[PDB]
Amino acid sequence: MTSATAHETVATGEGLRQALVGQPASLTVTTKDKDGRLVRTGSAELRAEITGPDGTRLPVPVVDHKNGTYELVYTARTEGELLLSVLLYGQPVRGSPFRVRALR
């Protein structure tokens, strides 16, 4: 196997752009190497956090699956636009920071 890179790591999910207050918002992060190929090791260093309208930071937990996919879920309780940052080895993945619309 090879090492995953942040420039080619892909994140998908409705939680990347929309969240309902009180409801868990989920997203999936897929790690890839420098050549854009899929890596299957589940020991990558992936961290995430979300920043509310007041600048308060809150972590977003990650569950490392056996393959090269990582499930991330968060429950927003303050409405407004949120900023979701996903870091792999300290570097933002492709697309992060994400702008999340949190309603209700």
UniProtKB/Swiss-Prot annotation:
It is found in: Cytoplasm; Early endosome; Golgi apparatus, trans-Golgi network; Cell projection, Dendrite. Expressed in brain, heart, uterus and testis. It comes from the Eukaryota. Filamin repeats lie at residues 2-102. The interaction with MYO5B is dependent upon its NHL repeats, which form a beta-propeller (NHL) domain containing six blades. Belongs to the TRIM/RBCC family. Forms homooligomers. Interacts with TRIM2; this interaction reduces TRIM2 activity. Associates with myosin-Vb (MYO5B) and alpha-actinin-4 (ACTN4). Component of the CART complex, at least composed of ACTN4, HGS/HRS, MYO5B and TRIM3. Interacts with ZFYVE28/LST2. Interacts with KIF21B. E3 ubiquitin ligase that plays essential roles in neuronal functions such as regulation of neuronal plasticity, learning, and memory. In addition to its neuronal functions, participates in other biological processes such as innate immunity or cell cycle regulation. Component of the cytoskeleton-associated recycling or transport complex in neurons, polyubiquitinates gamma-actin, thus regulating neuronal plasticity, learning, and memory. Ubiquitinates postsynaptic scaffold GKAP, a neuronal substrate involved in synaptic remodeling and thereby modulates dendritic spine morphology. This is Tripartite motif-containing protein 3. It comes from Homo sapiens.
